[PDB]
Design an enzyme around this catalytic site. Structure first.
Site, mmCIF file in Angstrom:
data_model
loop_
_atom_site.group_PDB
_atom_site.id
_atom_site.type_symbol
_atom_site.label_atom_id
_atom_site.label_comp_id
_atom_site.label_asym_id
_atom_site.label_seq_id
_atom_site.Cartn_x
_atom_site.Cartn_y
_atom_site.Cartn_z
ATOM 1 N N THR A 115 -26.502 32.858 -25.302
ATOM 2 C CA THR A 115 -26.762 34.255 -24.995
ATOM 3 C C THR A 115 -28.046 34.599 -25.471
ATOM 4 O OG1 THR A 115 -26.356 36.491 -25.887
ATOM 5 C CG2 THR A 115 -26.249 34.718 -27.425
ATOM 6 N N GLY A 116 -28.320 35.886 -25.207
ATOM 7 C CA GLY A 116 -29.627 36.403 -25.353
ATOM 8 C C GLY A 116 -29.904 37.054 -26.765
ATOM 9 N N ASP A 117 -28.890 37.357 -27.638
ATOM 10 C CA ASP A 117 -28.992 37.719 -28.771
ATOM 11 C C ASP A 117 -30.010 37.094 -29.704
ATOM 12 O OD1 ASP A 117 -26.933 40.377 -28.735
ATOM 13 O OD2 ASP A 117 -25.783 38.766 -28.209
ATOM 14 N N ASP B 241 -21.932 31.471 -20.768
ATOM 15 C CA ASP B 241 -22.370 32.484 -21.127
ATOM 16 C C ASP B 241 -21.925 33.586 -21.874
ATOM 17 O OD1 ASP B 241 -25.155 31.874 -19.842
ATOM 18 O OD2 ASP B 241 -23.526 31.847 -18.037
ATOM 19 N N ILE C 186 0.913 -1.131 0.137
ATOM 20 C CA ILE C 186 0.174 0.237 -0.054
ATOM 21 C C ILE C 186 0.809 1.366 0.042
ATOM 22 C CG2 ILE C 186 -1.493 1.398 1.347
ATOM 23 C CD1 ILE C 186 -2.682 -1.517 2.397
ATOM 24 N N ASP D 33 -25.338 31.614 -12.939
ATOM 25 C CA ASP D 33 -25.151 32.801 -12.310
ATOM 26 C C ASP D 33 -26.091 32.846 -11.152
ATOM 27 O OD1 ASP D 33 -25.077 35.573 -11.347
ATOM 28 O OD2 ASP D 33 -24.687 36.449 -13.341
ATOM 29 N N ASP E 3 -29.584 28.560 -11.851
ATOM 30 C CA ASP E 3 -28.413 28.075 -12.857
ATOM 31 C C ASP E 3 -27.880 26.820 -11.986
ATOM 32 O OD1 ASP E 3 -28.552 28.862 -15.115
ATOM 33 O OD2 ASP E 3 -27.311 30.820 -14.520
HETATM 34 N N1 ACP Z 1 -34.221 49.025 -21.972
HETATM 35 C C1 ACP Z 1 -35.044 48.675 -23.118
HETATM 36 N N2 ACP Z 1 -36.236 49.213 -23.524
HETATM 37 C C2 ACP Z 1 -36.549 48.734 -25.169
HETATM 38 N N3 ACP Z 1 -36.427 47.667 -25.281
HETATM 39 C C3 ACP Z 1 -35.335 47.065 -24.852
HETATM 40 C C4 ACP Z 1 -34.728 47.415 -23.600
HETATM 41 N N4 ACP Z 1 -33.683 46.701 -23.425
HETATM 42 C C5 ACP Z 1 -33.528 45.529 -24.328
HETATM 43 N N5 ACP Z 1 -34.695 45.906 -25.279
HETATM 44 C C6 ACP Z 1 -34.929 45.076 -26.447
HETATM 45 O O1 ACP Z 1 -35.629 43.758 -26.110
HETATM 46 C C7 ACP Z 1 -35.226 42.872 -26.937
HETATM 47 C C8 ACP Z 1 -35.341 41.437 -26.116
HETATM 48 O O2 ACP Z 1 -34.274 41.363 -25.146
HETATM 49 P P1 ACP Z 1 -34.384 41.183 -23.674
HETATM 50 O O3 ACP Z 1 -34.127 42.662 -23.136
HETATM 51 O O4 ACP Z 1 -35.413 40.384 -23.211
HETATM 52 O O5 ACP Z 1 -32.941 40.519 -23.150
HETATM 53 P P2 ACP Z 1 -31.363 41.109 -22.621
HETATM 54 O O6 ACP Z 1 -30.585 41.902 -23.626
HETATM 55 O O7 ACP Z 1 -31.472 41.537 -21.316
HETATM 56 C C9 ACP Z 1 -30.760 39.390 -22.700
HETATM 57 P P3 ACP Z 1 -29.636 38.557 -22.060
HETATM 58 O O8 ACP Z 1 -29.917 37.458 -21.366
HETATM 59 O O9 ACP Z 1 -28.454 38.065 -22.964
HETATM 60 O O10 ACP Z 1 -28.610 39.418 -21.228
HETATM 61 C C10 ACP Z 1 -33.637 43.105 -27.591
HETATM 62 O O11 ACP Z 1 -33.692 42.678 -28.660
HETATM 63 C C11 ACP Z 1 -33.834 44.799 -27.464
HETATM 64 O O12 ACP Z 1 -34.076 45.128 -28.636
#
Ligand code: ACP
Ligand code: TG1
Ligand code: K
Ligand code: MG
Length: 994
Positions: free
Chosen positions: A625-627, A351, A307, A703, A707
């Site tokens: 992402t959110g885009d 993310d 061991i 985050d 998550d």
């Molecule tokens: N303060 C605001 N006023 C109006 N429209 C807004 C805004 N902030 C974002 N948007 C619009 O809302 C759409 C949807 O995006 P959402 O605002 O729900 O997400 P987010 O940009 O916070 C996502 P993530 O999780 O990647 O950070 C975007 O394509 C943008 O054009």
């Protein structure tokens, strides 16, 4: 009530049969408690001392050790009445090793945190309810709250259960629910139902979630679900139910002890069979007690030789020191053993916002309408310099700077940006740096407006604290903001309703300014602003508008775009109900397009390179992402994940697209995919499991509380430094700088660590191989113990332990990251290398006993039967005639044992050098590359010389210092191990496969 968000105020009241103005009845509380139980997450999974020390001993090697102490301990009660009081030293040391072991296993428990427990931090002690016993509200234990209860909350309260809002007493109700997701902007809440019964939590505008905080307001509500049936509750159970596999090293070490145990048994049987002639011995005489002593004292020597008792302590030192090295490079590792799984990482899901990017946005391009005339269309495009939130920067038209005030569309586009904005600025004096007040994407707008003095305000001399909101304020002086319509994702826009604040500025009456995602707001426009004038919206202009938005978003610019618009004739204030977002899109219709704005969330400086490192290293990177998918693919191209002109019809996906696939195509998608856009938090766990099904080793970023289950599920869970406490405790690693590049640096260090760890594991195990042959020969040839167990203990914990530690500090390979990830199913010793340690252990076992044998037979300080009859030393105290006209206690001499031991200690320093490299010679790879290891060899030799010379210790070890002539034999015997490996190494490269 599961679907309480999709039901009416009345329906929920009717479901439980409770009255909003009265509350539940004492009977109804009795009944609701036995049905739904108390409002709490289950008590912690109980463990204790008595159960903890046993866990230390449900290992298998340590079990065998424990048995070896017992025999030794009885042996220390039969050797002699007075040959040695050091008879007792053997078993008492083995116990220490076990106890020390046991002790450490539990101060590693009194410290370790629990993520299921870290949830409890979000259970408030108390709550407030109305019930039928009392008119007024009563504060009670959140534990005792029940589904169907009428609950009250207000500013600063932690939310006790999952609650359907009934009526908002205050003028508005905002909630911090960042404990779930991470983004801290509080959100407006309403009363009307949310029609979709399968709605995601972000869209549940009329629900309050247990664990969240009230930021502003006061509301009465009815309790939908409690305890484990809440949203944070439904996460506790996903986290409990998820079981972490063992690291491939623990997996290998477990498999080692399993085979080691069966080997020992073979050797015992063998030892017995070779001494089966002993059955042909005469019956009368001998000494069974001395036979049983001998097959037992050899039985324990067999255990401590097999061991690698030092090994767990060495592994743990490398990890602990590697860990501290890694914290220097921004990575905070949580559990020591995950350093091994980290370096094995085959796929990384990060993310984008905050980790691949800086989350520091500013506006880069912008355009208004310059002229409309039939089909003929002219935009007016601009650029804007300056990347930070600071108001330093200028606007340009085809690269010459411009004075923005001479464009009327520009002054309007400015005011929308300033008014349609819940965020702002404040200058910090301790840092000298402009930071943001709310949302990053809005703060970019409030910064943009500071760069185009639309009214050409003499701001060239303002104090910085008051420079913060200067151009914005002049646009606040112009219109009073009567109220605002919050953003929601159905219509993806927000707006504000304004009245002019003077009587000479009081022109044109009331207006709505609107911003949002471009598709949605441009579809609601029937007009277009050209300067001060206005013109009906048409094809040619809508084309050449969405045209430029597709370029800005899907181009190498990768820009986030908002459309800006005004409603020139808003409805009368009395004809709007403001309590219900269902109608806010309809209120925001018949608009005038004013302009489009495009901002950047830049990649980090280091991300470009870390992705190429990942290609070099056979690691798949997966963006999340959110885009919109379109700009999502575009950012991938810009950071290296995709090639520019490379087809990706089948390697990107939105959540909506991912769900519409039957479960088959979903698993396959995860093998190819490198991009996921607009996901639902549940999709992270799904993605992991699919990746796992291909035996991937997955790193996942995350985050917030929601998550946690994917963090706990992935092989390596990665939390952000600025993340929640819970997500940190659910992760194997924390990024103090929230930066992706840190992950790649951690994989690199974790590969450099294991390749070192790979060698000292090989190193220590091989010595144990050699020891066991020494022991086996002792028993098979019939020799006096060449090596007593007490000595072996020293060698494995101290003498061997120091080079092994120095070996964790081997220089890294230059090509660490130019090789693919390592298969976890990779054996440490196999095929040809197994045959090689088989030969070297073979050596050591022979050289060690031959050092004892030499001192007995062919040496100057002891006569010994050159006829080999020394063998029958146990029968010396009676058979003086049979070729034994000399002494008898000499076969328990210290001198020939130290000969063995010295040969062992010297051999092991040599083997440590052969262990600097698996297959490379020392004429190609000098010993002085690892300076810390040359150094540590010198140390152990001293300690050998220490226990050979310092009067208390030699008796303890049954040792005895040897003279210059005996060291020269020791070297003669031991130095050739170098030459032996150098040959087998020569074979490996030149003649086999490699
Ligand atoms: N303060 C605001 N006023 C109006 N429209 C807004 C805004 N902030 C974002 N948007 C619009 O809302 C759409 C949807 O995006 P959402 O605002 O729900 O997400 P987010 O940009 O916070 C996502 P993530 O999780 O990647 O950070 C975007 O394509 C943008 O054009
Ligand atoms: C450690 C002490 C020795 C005596 C031993 O039993 O190790 C064996 C055994 C445990 C395997 C073998 C040893 O096998 C032998 O040496 C054959 C028996 C010789 C008979 C003795 C009398 C002459 C290892 C030691 O042999 C070599 C040649 O080094 C290598 C390796 O071990 C490792 O991979 C270590 C795990 C990190 C393992 O084959 C291992 O089992 C498998 O599961 C592995 C994959 O583990
Ligand atoms: K995990
Ligand atoms: Mg956003």
């Amino acid at each position: 009530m599961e679907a309480a968000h999709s039901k009416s105020t009345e329906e929920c009241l009717a479901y439980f049969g409770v009255s909003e103005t009265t509350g539940l009845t004492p009977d109804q509380v009795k009944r609701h408690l036995e049905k739904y139980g108390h409002n709490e997450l289950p008590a912690e999974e109980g463990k204790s001392l008595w159960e903890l020390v046993i866990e230390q001993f449900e290992d298998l090697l340590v079990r065998i050790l424990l048995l070896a102490a017992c025999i030794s301990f009885v042996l220390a009660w039969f050797e002699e009445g007075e040959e040695t009081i050091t008879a007792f030293v053997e078993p008492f040391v083995i116990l220490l090793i076990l106890i020390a072991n046991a002790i450490v296993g539990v101060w590693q428990e009194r410290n370790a945190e629990n993520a299921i427990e870290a949830l409890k931090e979000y259970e408030p002690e108390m709550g407030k309810v109305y019930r039928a016993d009392r008119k007024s509200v009563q504060r009670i234990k959140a534990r005792d709250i029940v589904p169907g209860d009428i609950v009250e909350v207000a500013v600063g309260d932690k939310v006790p259960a999952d609650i359907r809002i009934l009526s908002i007493k205050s003028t508005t109700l905002r909630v911090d629910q960042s404990i779930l997701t991470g983004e801290s902007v509080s959100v407006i809440k309403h009363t009307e139902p949310v029609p979709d019964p399968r709605a995601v939590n972000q869209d549940k505008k009329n629900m309050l979630f247990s664990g969240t905080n009230i930021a502003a307001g006061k509301a009465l509500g009815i309790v939908a679900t409690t305890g484990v049936s809440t949203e944070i509750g439904k996460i506790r159970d996903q986290m409990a139910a998820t079981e972490q596999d063992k690291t491939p090293l623990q997996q290998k070490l477990d498999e080692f002890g399993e085979q080691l145990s069966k080997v020992i048994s073979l050797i015992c049987v063998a030892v017995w069979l070779i001494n089966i002639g002993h059955f042909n011995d005469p019956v009368h005489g001998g000494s069974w007690i001395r036979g049983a002593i001998y097959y037992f004292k050899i039985a324990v020597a067999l255990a401590v030789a097999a061991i690698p008792e030092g090994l767990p302590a060495v592994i743990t030192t490398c990890l602990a020191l590697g860990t501290r090295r890694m914290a220097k490079k921004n990575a905070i590792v949580r559990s020591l053993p995950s350093v091994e799984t980290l370096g094995c990482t085959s796929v990384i899901c990060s993310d984008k916002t905050g980790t691949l990017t800086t989350n520091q946005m500013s506006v880069c391009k912008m355009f208004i309408i310059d002229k409309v005339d039939g089909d003929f269309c002219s935009l007016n495009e601009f650029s804007i310099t300056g990347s930070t939130y600071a108001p330093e920067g200028e606007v340009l038209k085809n690269d010459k700077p411009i004075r923005s005030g001479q464009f009327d569309g520009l002054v309007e586009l400015a005011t929308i940006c300033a008014l349609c904005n819940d965020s702002s600025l404040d200058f910090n004096e301790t840092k000298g740096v402009y930071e943001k007040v709310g949302e990053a994407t809005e703060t970019a707008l409030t910064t943009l407006v500071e760069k185009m003095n639309v009214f050409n305000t003499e701001v060239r001399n303002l104090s910085k604290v008051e420079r913060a909101n200067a151009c914005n304020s002049v646009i606040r002086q112009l219109m009073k903001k009567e109220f605002t319509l919050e953003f929601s994702r159905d219509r993806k826009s927000m707006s504000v309703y304004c009245s002019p604040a003077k009587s000479s500025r009081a022109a044109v009456g009331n207006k709505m300014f609107v911003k949002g995602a471009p598709e949605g707001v441009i579809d609601r426009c029937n007009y277009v602003r050209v300067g001060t004038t206005r013109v009906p919206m048409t094809g040619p202009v809508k084309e050449k508008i969405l045209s430029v938005i597709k370029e800005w978003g899907t181009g190498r610019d990768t820009l986030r775009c908002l459309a800006l618009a005004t409603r020139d004739t808003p409805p009368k204030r009395e004809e709007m109900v403001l309590d219900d977002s269902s109608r806010f899109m309809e209120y925001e219709t018949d608009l005038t397009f004013v302009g489009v704005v495009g901002m950047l969330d830049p990649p980090r400086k280091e991300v470009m390179g870390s992705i190429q490192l990942c290609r070099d290293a056979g690691i798949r990177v997966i963006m999340i992402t959110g885009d919109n998918k379109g700009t999502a693919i575009a950012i991938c191209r810009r950071i290296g994940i995709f090639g520019e002109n490379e087809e990706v019809a089948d390697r990107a996906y939105t959540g909506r697209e991912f769900d519409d696939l039957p479960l088959a195509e979903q698993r396959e998608a995860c093998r190819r995919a490198c991009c996921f856009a607009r996901v639902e938090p549940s999709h992270k766990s799904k993605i992991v499991e699919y990746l796992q099904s291909y035996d991937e080793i997955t790193a996942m970023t995350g985050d917030g509380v929601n998550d946690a289950p994917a963090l706990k599920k992935a092989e390596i869970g990665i939390a952000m430094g600025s993340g929640t406490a819970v997500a940190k405790t659910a992760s194997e690693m924390v990024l103090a700088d929230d930066n992706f590049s840190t992950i790649v640096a951690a994989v690199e260090e974790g590969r450099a660590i294991y390749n070192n760890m790979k060698q000292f594991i090989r190193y220590l195990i091989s010595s144990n191989v050699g020891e066991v042959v020494c022991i086996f020969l002792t028993a098979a040839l019939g020799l006096p113990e060449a090596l007593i167990p007490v000595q072996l203990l020293w060698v494995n914990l101290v003498t061997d332990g120091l080079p092994a530690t120095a070996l964790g500090f081997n220089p890294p390979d230059l090509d660490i990251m130019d090789r693919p990830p390592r298969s976890p199913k990779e054996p440490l010793i196999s095929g040809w290398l197994f045959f090689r340690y088989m030969a070297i252990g073979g050596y050591v076992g022979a050289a060690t006993v031959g050092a004892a044998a030499w001192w007995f037979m062919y040496a100057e300080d002891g006569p010994g039967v050159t006829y080999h009859q020394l063998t029958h030393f146990m029968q010396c105290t009676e058979d003086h005639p049979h070729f034994e006209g000399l002494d008898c206690e000499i076969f328990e001499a210290p001198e020939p044992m130290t000969m063995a031991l010295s040969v062992l200690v010297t051999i092991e320093m040599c083997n440590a050098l052969n262990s600097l490299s698996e297959n490379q010679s020392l004429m190609r790879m000098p010993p002085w590359v690892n300076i810390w290891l040359l150094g540590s060899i010198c140390l152990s030799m001293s300690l050998h010389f220490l226990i050979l010379y310092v009067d208390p210790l030699p008796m303890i070890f049954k040792l005895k210092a040897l003279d210059l002539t005996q060291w020269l034999m020791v070297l003669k015997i031991s130095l050739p191990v170098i030459g032996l490996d150098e040959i087998l190494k020569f074979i490996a490269r030149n003649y086999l496969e490699g």
